[PDB]
Structure formats: C-alpha cells, structure tokens
C-alpha cells in the first residue's frame, strides 16, 4: 500500500492511538482513535482494510484482555467492530493467508494459549483450527508461500527459541529448526524467501540482534543488528525494506523507527514516532 499504520500500544497505560507514517515524505498523521485502548495487539490488512486483533486494556480502571477484532477503513477514517474471537488473546500474533486472518497464541490472564483460530471476513466468522504444539505468548507470526509460522514467545514457564509451521491443507503444525536465540516479544516478518526475527527478550536482556530463516535451507542466519535493543516492537515491510517501530529497551519506551535495507545489510533511523510506546500493532495499506 502506501502508509505504515501503528495502532495502540503502551506508555503508562494502554493506548488508543492510530497514527500513519508516510515513507515517501516523512510525515505522521493522527487518525481515528481505537474505540478501546489496547496494548499487546497485532495489526494486519485484508482487502485494503486494517484490522486490530486482540491485546489488553491496561488502564487505571482495571486490566482487561481483549478478544476483539476491529476494522479500520481508510476511506472513512472509521473503526467498526467485527466478530470477537473464541478467547481473549493478549500478546498475540497474527498472519493473513488467502484473505483469512489467523490469530495465534497469546494470553488470557495466566492462561497461555496454544490455540489458533481463523477469521473469514466474507462471513464475519471465527473458527478454531488445530492448536500449536507449544503454548506461545509474545509469539512472532509470519506468512511465507501460504504457510503460517509461529516463532518464539513464552510458554508460561520459559521464553523460547523454538518455532513451528502450520500447513493449512493438512490442518497440522510441525516444528521447524529453532532460532539461534531465545526470543519473546520479537518482531517477526517476511522478506523475500526468509522469515526475519528482530529483537525480543531472551529472559535476561532486550535484544538488538536479528536473524532470518531460509525456508529452502531450513537454517537461521544472523544479519546486521538493529541500532537499538528492543522488545515488544512493531514490525512491517514496505517496498522491500523492514521497519521496526518502538518497543522497550530496558530503560525507555522507544519512539525510534529503524529501517533495514537487505541489499546493504544495514539499519538506519528513518523517523521517530510522535511518542515512545511499546506493544503496538502495525500494518501497511492505502492512505486515508
Ligand atoms: C506494563 C508493560 C511494560 C512493558 C515493558 C511492556 C513492553 C508492556 S507491553 O504492552 O508492550 N507488552 C507486551 C507486548 C508484546 C509482547 C510482550 N511480551 N510477550 C512475552 C514477553 C516476555 O517477556 O516474554 C513480552 C515482553 C518482552 C516484551 C509484551 C507493558 C504493558
């Protein structure tokens, strides 16, 4: 599309912001607030519409995990509710295959989900599919060649370096090669034939390292590290480059946005968000 949308997040409390960054001119636009504040959500796009999935409203009033699915139409600058998921899912990951939204893992209080469910926009319906082999919150999710990958996270006891792949026509999950780093709350995305995992928390430190999985070789390789360590970052791809947005570096809720050029294997700072925050949802679609 043309703009990078960032929805929600956390700073002092869960946020309702929807802001759109335009890489062509450096500008940020503030758009219609989410109806309910949420951090730990995920964003995705189907048919030009932006969806916000799951998360949690951490507020002074209290703290409520979200099962919600909401749809933002850039033409109208309006959010509409969709059908809710079977369960609340904070610290969720999502991926889109063939116009359907897969919601993966996440938490409902102390419940760490392995369950996975699929949304069909044409019917406004969710249905459960086979669960993952592992409970995963803070799970990175990406789609490559119409297969769904769940990467890292936290299973209730340990942060994970494991990853697995969902084969839709078999409704089956299988482990893939584990990452070389334990990562929970990483940013995961796809670029060319690789799944990238950037940042996260390894149980001790927020990470700046970045590694990628080549589906043909089934191996993970480190690339250039980000300039800033970060967990609970937003991540997306725009014209062949990876953008990482915000996160937490152990000291500060970051406003930094970095951009990875895979041809030069370099990261550069490209803009700052209007305020530091973590736990955002991010996706790319047409300008409003
Ligand atoms: C109060 C508070 C404080 C801080 C520092 C943050 C970041 C958030 S937050 O909204 O950004 N929360 C969030 C979003 C996405 C993923 C994760 N997440 N999932 C698993 C783990 C882990 O520690 O294993 C994490 C952590 C490593 C990132 C967590 C909140 C509410």
From Swiss-Prot:
Effect of mutating residue 10 to A: Impaired interaction with SQSTM1/p62
Feature type site, description Sensor for electrophilic agents: 110
Annotated compartments: Cytoplasm; Nucleus
Outcome of mutating residue 58 to A: Impaired interaction with SQSTM1/p62
S-cGMP-cysteine sites (modified residues): 110
Effect in UniProt of substituting residue 184 to A: Impaired interaction with SQSTM1/p62
UniProt PTM: Non-enzymatic covalent modifications of reactive cysteines by electrophile metabolites inactivate the BCR(KEAP1) complex. Accumulation of fumarate promotes the formation of cysteine S-succination (S-(2-succinyl)cysteine), leading to inactivate the BCR(KEAP1) complex and promote NFE2L2/NRF2 nuclear accumulation and activation. Nitric oxide-dependent 8-Nitro-cGMP formation promotes cysteine guanylation (S-cGMP-cysteine), leading to NFE2L2/NRF2 nuclear accumulation and activation. Degraded via a proteasomal-independent process during selective autophagy: interaction with phosphorylated SQSTM1/p62 sequesters KEAP1 in inclusion bodies, leading to its degradation.
Source taxon at top rank: Eukaryota
UniProt effect for mutating residue 56 to M: Impaired interaction with NFE2L2/NRF2
Reported consequences of knocking out the gene: Early postnatal lethality caused by abnormal cornification. Mice survive until weaning and probably die from malnutrition resulting from hyperkeratosis in the esophagus and forestomach that cause gastric obstruction. Defects are caused by constitutive activation Nfe2l2/Nrf2, leading to constitutive expression of phase 2 detoxifying enzymes. Mice lacking both Nfe2l2/Nrf2 and Keap1 reverse the hyperkeratosis phenotype and are healthy and viable in normal conditions.
Function: Substrate-specific adapter of a BCR (BTB-CUL3-RBX1) E3 ubiquitin ligase complex that regulates the response to oxidative stress by targeting NFE2L2/NRF2 for ubiquitination. KEAP1 acts as a key sensor of oxidative and electrophilic stress: in normal conditions, the BCR(KEAP1) complex mediates ubiquitination and degradation of NFE2L2/NRF2, a transcription factor regulating expression of many cytoprotective genes.
Subunit structure and binding partners: Component of the BCR(KEAP1) E3 ubiquitin ligase complex, at least composed of 2 molecules of CUL3, 2 molecules of KEAP1, and RBX1. Interacts with NFE2L2/NRF2; the interaction is direct. Forms a ternary complex with NFE2L2/NRF2 and PGAM5. Interacts with (phosphorylated) SQSTM1/p62; the interaction is direct and inactivates the BCR(KEAP1) complex by sequestering it in inclusion bodies, promoting its degradation. Interacts with NFE2L1. Interacts with BPTF and PTMA. Interacts with MAP1LC3B. Interacts indirectly with ENC1. Interacts with SESN1 and SESN2. Interacts with HSP90AA1 and HSP90AB1.
Domain characteristics, as noted in the entry: The Kelch repeats mediate interaction with NFE2L2/NRF2, BPTF and PGAM5.
Family statement: Belongs to the KEAP1 family.
Name assigned to this protein: Kelch-like ECH-associated protein 1
Organism lineage string: Eukaryota, Metazoa, Chordata, Craniata, Vertebrata
Gene behind this protein: Keap1
Coverage span on the entire protein: 325 to 612 of 624
């Amino acid at each position: 599309g043309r703009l990078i949308y960032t929805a929600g997040g956390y700073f002092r409390q869960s946020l309702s912001y929807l802001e759109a960054y335009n890489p062509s001119n450096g500008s940020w636009l503030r758009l219609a607030d989410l109806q309910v504040p949420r951090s730990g959500l995920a964003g995705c796009v189907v048919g030009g519409l932006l969806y916000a999935v799951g998360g949690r409203n951490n507020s002074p009033d209290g703290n409520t995990d979200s099962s919600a699915l909401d749809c933002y139409n850039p033409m109208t600058n309006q959010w509409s509710p969709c059908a809710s998921m079977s369960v609340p899912r904070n610290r969720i990951g999502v991926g889109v295959i063939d116009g359907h939204i897969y919601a993966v893992g996440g938490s409902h209080g102390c419940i760490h989900h392995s369950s996975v469910e699929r949304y069909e926009p044409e019917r406004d319906e969710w249905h459960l599919v086979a669960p993952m082999l592992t409970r995963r919150i803070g799970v990175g999710v990406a789609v490559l060649n119409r297969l769904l990958y769940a990467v890292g996270g936290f299973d209730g006891t340990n942060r994970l370096n494991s990853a697995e792949c969902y084969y839709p026509e078999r409704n089956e999950w299988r482990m893939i090669t584990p990452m070389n780093t334990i990562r929970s709350g990483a940013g995961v995305c796809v670029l060319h034939n690789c799944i990238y995992a950037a940042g996260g928390y390894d149980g001790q430190d927020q990470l700046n390292s970045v590694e990628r999985y080549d589906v043909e070789t089934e191996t993970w390789t480190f690339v250039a590290p980000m300039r800033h360590h970060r967990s609970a970052l937003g991540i997306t791809v725009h014209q062949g480059k990876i953008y990482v947005l915000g996160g937490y570096d152990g000291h500060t809720f970051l406003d930094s946005v970095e951009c990875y050029d895979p041809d030069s294997d370099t990261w550069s700072e490209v803009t700052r968000m209007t305020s530091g925050r973590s736990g955002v949802g991010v996706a790319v679609t047409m300008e409003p």
